[PDB]
Amino acid sequence: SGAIYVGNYRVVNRHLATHNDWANLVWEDSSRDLLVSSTTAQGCDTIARCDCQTGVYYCSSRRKHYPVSFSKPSLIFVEASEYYPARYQSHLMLAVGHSEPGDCGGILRCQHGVVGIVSTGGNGLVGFADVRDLLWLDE
Numbered sequence: 001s002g003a004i005y006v007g008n009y010r011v012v013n014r015h016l017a018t019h020n021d022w023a024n025l026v027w028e029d030s031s032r033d034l035l036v037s038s039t040t041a042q043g044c045d046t047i048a049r050c051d052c053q054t055g056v057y058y059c060s061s062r063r064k065h066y067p068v069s070f071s072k073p074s075l076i077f078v079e080a081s082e083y084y085p086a087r088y089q090s091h092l093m094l095a096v097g098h099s100e101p102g103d104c105g106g107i108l109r110c111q112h113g114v115v116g117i118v119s120t121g122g123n124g125l126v127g128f129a130d131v132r133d134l135l136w137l138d139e
């Protein structure tokens with residue numbers, strides 16, 4: 001699990017979104033595994049605005065941050081899961097690293113701030129849902 005909190009926005013894996021998230025829906029994209037909901041408290045996180053392909057992500061199944069190289073956000077075929085059928089996930093970034101289902105919502109960070117959140121894994125790869133394109137998260 002895990003979320004990004006920026007201004008009055010909460011960014012979560014669409015597949016981990018609660019009833020409060022859906023009751024306070026701002027925007028959801030099933031093909032990206034993202035849902036944003038509205039919050040009352042002000043969030044302290046900064047979204048990266050950049051095209052970094054290096055950063056650090058939190059891996060809850062190792063209680064460890066790992067530095068990774070990651071591919072630019074693209075449309076990648078992702079196999080069926082405990083939460084989805086096999087489909088093209090959009091705006092997805094892969095790196096070589098450890099990811100289990102419960103690692104979803106781990107944050108990937110570069111020097112500019114938050115890049116995205118763990119969304120996919122398996123076969124020694126970790127997939128991160130990019131958020132850097134969502135400029136509206138910052139006003």
Ligand SMILES: CN(C)C(=O)c1ccc(F)cc1Br
Pocket residue numbers: 079080081082099100101102103104118119120121122
């Ligand atoms: C077989 N497979 C794809 C996994 O166990 C997996 C790994 C990480 C993740 F975030 C989601 C899943 Br589903």
Ligand SMILES: [Zn+2]
Pocket residue numbers: 048049050051052110111112113
């Ligand atoms: Zn960056």
